[PDB]
Design a protein around this ligand. Structure first.
Ligand SMILES: CN1CCN(CCCN2c3ccccc3Sc3ccc(C(F)(F)F)cc32)CC1
Ligand SMILES: [Ca+2]
Ligand SMILES: [Ca+2]
Ligand SMILES: [Ca+2]
Ligand SMILES: [Ca+2]
Length: 141
């Protein structure tokens, strides 16, 4: 086996209450759409239904933490689009100022001490920024 330590079970819950803006425990389409339009994507009502049913195991309309937790654990294009969300200034790297805005507006509010923690973790070469390859590896898996 490879794993899923209790470091990630606490992080995916964070990623969890980011879509689940009201507590509830489930993430509805209104929530999925509200985070999307906030990430540069205005999707519709059926693209949203089509996304929550292909990830919601007990087909109950919503997505609770088990489902959210199974999906996020054991391809591309999409990443290129994702690399662009942060790289607002389209220059080939995502700095700590870029990571951070995207979150805020996303709702998150981290200190000046968690964005470096974040970049540092996914920053291979050592310069303090995140380039296209470092973003693909990080996410390939
Ligand atoms: C192999 N490998 C192991 C670990 N990482 C860390 C990924 C860091 N990451 C990040 C980095 C740069 C730009 C954006 C992002 S999104 C993000 C969100 C949460 C976390 C969070 F919550 F964990 F901090 C880490 C990341 C990348 C690749
Ligand atoms: Ca909710
Ligand atoms: Ca469900
Ligand atoms: Ca940039
Ligand atoms: Ca780097």
């Amino acid at each position: 086996a490879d794993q899923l330590t209790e470091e990630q079970i606490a992080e995916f819950k964070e990623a969890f209450s980011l879509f689940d803006k009201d507590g509830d425990g489930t993430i509805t389409t209104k929530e999925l759409g509200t985070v999307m339009r906030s990430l540069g994507q205005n999707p519709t009502e059926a693209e949203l239904q089509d996304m929550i049913n292909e990830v919601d195991a007990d087909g109950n309309g919503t997505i609770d933490f088990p489902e959210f937790l199974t999906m996020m654990a054991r391809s591309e294009e999409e990443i290129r689009e994702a690399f662009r969300v942060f790289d607002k200034d389209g220059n080939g790297y995502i700095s700590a100022a870029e990571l951070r805005h995207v979150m805020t507006n996303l709702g998150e509010k981290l200190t000046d001490e968690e964005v470096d923690e974040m970049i540092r973790e996914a920053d291979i070469d050592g310069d303090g920024q995140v380039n296209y390859e470092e973003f693909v590896q990080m996410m390939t898996a």
